[PDB]
């Protein structure tokens with residue numbers, strides 16, 4: 001967590017239906033956006049911090 | 051000399067400008083554009099904004 | 100493995116979506132239709148509905 005990894009996602013298409021239809025998550029909280037709207041939104045960049 | 055008339059026009063214009071500019075205020079919402087709120091948020095969360 | 104739920108490891112991924120004025124480069128699996136001009140349409144340009 002102190003050296004949390006960051007990856008930059010750009011210039012690609014993502015099917016977020018797979019992500020939020022998954023039952024493998026205990027926490028899935030989206031602020032400022034809805035999980036079911038991501039398939040209709042285009043973003044300049046995404047950062048995945050793990 | 052015609053300022054009295056022009057003044058009136060100016061005032062009206064000013065008022066409308068302010069009105070239009072108020073559409074760019076968030077008033078606490080995440081966005082001042084209704085289309086962005088509706089396209090990003092579910093109805094339960096969109097109605098709050 | 101014997102720890103309680105409050106101390107078991109949890110893997111966390113935080114997705115930060117940035118919507119700037121720059122060209123969009125991460126999109127959903129939504130197919131683009133033909134461009135229709137001179138008509139009243141319901142357009143969606145890079146999520147700008």
Ligand SMILES: *[C@@H]1O[C@H](CO[C@@H]2O[C@@H](C)[C@@H](O)[C@@H](O)[C@@H]2O)[C@@H](O[C@@H]2O[C@H](CO)[C@@H](O[C@@H]3O[C@H](CO[C@H]4O[C@H](CO)[C@@H](O)[C@H](O)[C@@H]4O)[C@@H](O)[C@H](O[C@H]4O[C@H](CO)[C@@H](O)[C@H](O)[C@@H]4O[C@H]4O[C@H](CO)[C@@H](O)[C@H](O)[C@@H]4O)[C@@H]3O)[C@H](O)[C@H]2NC(C)=O)[C@H](O)[C@H]1NC(C)=O
Nearest residue numbers: 015016017018019020021022023024025026027104110111
């Ligand atoms: C990398 O990804 C791999 C694949 O990911 C999948 O595909 C991607 C594209 C994406 O969609 C992902 O969301 C998706 O998961 C990972 O491999 C997968 O790993 C999964 C778990 O990490 C695993 O699912 C689990 O499988 C177990 C075992 O299933 C077998 O036995 C059952 C009988 O029990 C059979 O019916 C199955 O056919 C299998 O033969 C299963 O028990 C798990 O279900 C439990 O957990 C679910 C939530 O995860 C619950 O919804 C469900 O109700 C059930 O609940 C149990 O657990 C409770 C405790 O939590 C307990 O109290 C309760 O009583 C229940 O007993 C779960 O389904 C996938 O099978 C597996 N897929 C493959 C192909 O291997 C891989 O791990 C990933 N790698 C990394 C590093 O992350």
